[PDB]
Design an enzyme around this catalytic site. Sequence first.
Site, PDB file in Angstrom:
ATOM      1  N   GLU A   1       0.817  -1.212   0.000  1.00 52.37           N
ATOM      2  CA  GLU A   1       0.000   0.000   0.000  1.00 52.37           C
ATOM      3  C   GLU A   1       0.852   1.264   0.000  1.00 52.37           C
ATOM      4  O   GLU A   1       0.562   2.221  -0.700  1.00 52.37           O
ATOM      5  CB  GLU A   1      -0.935   0.019   1.218  1.00 52.37           C
ATOM      6  CG  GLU A   1      -1.796   1.271   1.265  1.00 52.37           C
ATOM      7  CD  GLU A   1      -2.882   1.285   2.341  1.00 52.37           C
ATOM      8  OE1 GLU A   1      -3.208   0.241   2.921  1.00 52.37           O
ATOM      9  OE2 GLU A   1      -3.408   2.389   2.618  1.00 52.37           O
TER      10      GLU A   1
ATOM     11  N   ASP B   1      -6.552  11.831   0.990  1.00 53.27           N
ATOM     12  CA  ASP B   1      -6.803  10.594   0.267  1.00 53.27           C
ATOM     13  C   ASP B   1      -7.700  10.839  -0.938  1.00 53.27           C
ATOM     14  O   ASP B   1      -7.931  11.985  -1.334  1.00 53.27           O
ATOM     15  CB  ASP B   1      -7.415   9.530   1.192  1.00 53.27           C
ATOM     16  CG  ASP B   1      -8.860   9.830   1.590  1.00 53.27           C
ATOM     17  OD1 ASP B   1      -9.383  10.918   1.261  1.00 53.27           O
ATOM     18  OD2 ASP B   1      -9.471   8.960   2.251  1.00 53.27           O
TER      19      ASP B   1
ATOM     20  N   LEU C   1      -6.965   7.114   8.459  1.00 59.36           N
ATOM     21  CA  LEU C   1      -7.817   8.295   8.365  1.00 59.36           C
ATOM     22  C   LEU C   1      -7.758   9.079   9.678  1.00 59.36           C
ATOM     23  O   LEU C   1      -7.910   8.506  10.756  1.00 59.36           O
ATOM     24  CB  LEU C   1      -9.253   7.854   8.090  1.00 59.36           C
ATOM     25  CG  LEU C   1     -10.355   8.916   8.035  1.00 59.36           C
ATOM     26  CD1 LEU C   1     -10.065   9.971   6.985  1.00 59.36           C
ATOM     27  CD2 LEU C   1     -11.703   8.264   7.772  1.00 59.36           C
TER      28      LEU C   1
ATOM     29  N   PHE D   1      -7.788  -5.421   4.720  1.00 57.37           N
ATOM     30  CA  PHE D   1      -7.469  -4.012   4.556  1.00 57.37           C
ATOM     31  C   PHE D   1      -7.793  -3.531   3.138  1.00 57.37           C
ATOM     32  O   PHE D   1      -8.308  -2.424   2.965  1.00 57.37           O
ATOM     33  CB  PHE D   1      -5.997  -3.714   4.864  1.00 57.37           C
ATOM     34  CG  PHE D   1      -5.733  -3.439   6.314  1.00 57.37           C
ATOM     35  CD1 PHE D   1      -6.218  -2.303   6.931  1.00 57.37           C
ATOM     36  CD2 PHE D   1      -5.018  -4.289   7.073  1.00 57.37           C
ATOM     37  CE1 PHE D   1      -5.976  -2.044   8.260  1.00 57.37           C
ATOM     38  CE2 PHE D   1      -4.774  -4.025   8.407  1.00 57.37           C
ATOM     39  CZ  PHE D   1      -5.249  -2.920   8.992  1.00 57.37           C
TER      40      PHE D   1
ATOM     41  N   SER E   1     -12.130 -20.474  -1.945  1.00 53.29           N
ATOM     42  CA  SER E   1     -10.710 -20.289  -1.667  1.00 53.29           C
ATOM     43  C   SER E   1     -10.452 -20.297  -0.153  1.00 53.29           C
ATOM     44  O   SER E   1      -9.456 -20.822   0.329  1.00 53.29           O
ATOM     45  CB  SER E   1     -10.185 -18.989  -2.268  1.00 53.29           C
ATOM     46  OG  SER E   1     -10.175 -19.060  -3.679  1.00 53.29           O
TER      47      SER E   1
ATOM     48  N   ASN F   1      -6.974 -20.600  -7.479  1.00 52.45           N
ATOM     49  CA  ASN F   1      -8.297 -20.043  -7.497  1.00 52.45           C
ATOM     50  C   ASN F   1      -8.314 -18.522  -7.285  1.00 52.45           C
ATOM     51  O   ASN F   1      -9.062 -17.787  -7.922  1.00 52.45           O
ATOM     52  CB  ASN F   1      -9.137 -20.724  -6.445  1.00 52.45           C
ATOM     53  CG  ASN F   1     -10.561 -20.810  -6.847  1.00 52.45           C
ATOM     54  OD1 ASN F   1     -10.889 -21.186  -7.983  1.00 52.45           O
ATOM     55  ND2 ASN F   1     -11.436 -20.445  -5.934  1.00 52.45           N
TER      56      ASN F   1
END
Length: 366
Positions: free
Chosen positions: A24, A33, A45, A117, A130, A145
């Site tokens: 990220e 953002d 945040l 996340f 999965s 998968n």
Amino acid sequence: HSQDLENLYFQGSMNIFEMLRIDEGLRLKIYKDTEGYYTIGIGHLLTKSPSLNAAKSELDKAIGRNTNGVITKDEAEKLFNQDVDAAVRGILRNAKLKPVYDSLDAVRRAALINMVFQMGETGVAGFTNSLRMLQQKRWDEAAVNLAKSRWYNQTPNRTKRVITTFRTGTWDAYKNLRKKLEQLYNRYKDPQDENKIGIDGIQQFCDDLALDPASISVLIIAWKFRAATQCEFSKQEFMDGMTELGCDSIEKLKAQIPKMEQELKEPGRFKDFYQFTFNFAKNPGQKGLDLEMAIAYWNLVLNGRFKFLDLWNKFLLEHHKRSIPKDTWNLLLDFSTMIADDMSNYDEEGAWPVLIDDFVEFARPQ
Ligand SMILES: C[C@@H](O)O[C@H]1CN(Cc2ccccc2)CC[C@@H]1NC(=O)Nc1cccc(C(F)(F)F)c1
């Protein structure tokens, strides 16, 4: 103190924070953002308030000092670990996710948290088959998968690393990513200062991308890398930008350039790029931009956009003015946007810079 990182020293050095730092990215200064909200760290945040001061108040509260909107990596890790604890609490209340989470080893739990996340509990819970494969330790099948999903299409490089983590139960994908970026950075770094890429390395980077260093594309790249100054490219800038752009190679960065260029057509983005140019171009030790450098960058960024650019050049070449302040730079774009083809709608009472008032007097006749 409960949040001290020393309390985690029994863990491995690779952890969920370092994983999300790769997948990220980490920001150490308050920024807005996507939805325009003040954020810091790894996607933390601060507030929905439009007030930066409010955001700084929340941040100062959380860190325990006067941060002025800038934090250290360790402080960001403390904020992130709070966020992880909350995400784990949610997982543990989720009837579909809890059994899978409980069954996984620590490394694979980090991979599941990474998914939460990125896409939230509902998104992760939708991977019914999965998740069952993971609970049954059918790792290769789970990996196959997961690779068929929209998740893979949306963020293929992140998703591949998370999938490798599920397949192997190791941090290999992250070690490999880190090494690839280090080795690539090392091609460009200043041999006398490993903390930056100098002029020679910038030239090499442009050459590897088959771009002229004086092209608008190269400025667009600097904008996307949020570069501080035209004279160097810091290691932090290089790493953060490759992370944000989802690239671990020059070929991938090359393929991303047209996408960067297209962003300039979205609302407010050309203005952001135009304003960025001033700070990037200016000498860091100066408050204003030398006139000659301002002219060069105006010609790069405004050619074909500002209908009076050639006349602006003529005007300035007569001028003495040593330099251009930020407000004057910014307002030239507003002038370009509003002005009629014959300059007949200029408002002399609009508190434009004197330079622009003088330009209108110079230009109207022509
Ligand atoms: C350093 C030398 O190889 O190239 C330069 C020549 N410059 C030519 C120019 C001058 C005035 C107006 C337009 C173009 C543009 C800046 C350009 N320097 C530059 O792109 N620096 C840079 C700094 C941080 C990050 C990046 C980037 F990310 F690779 F784009 C570039």
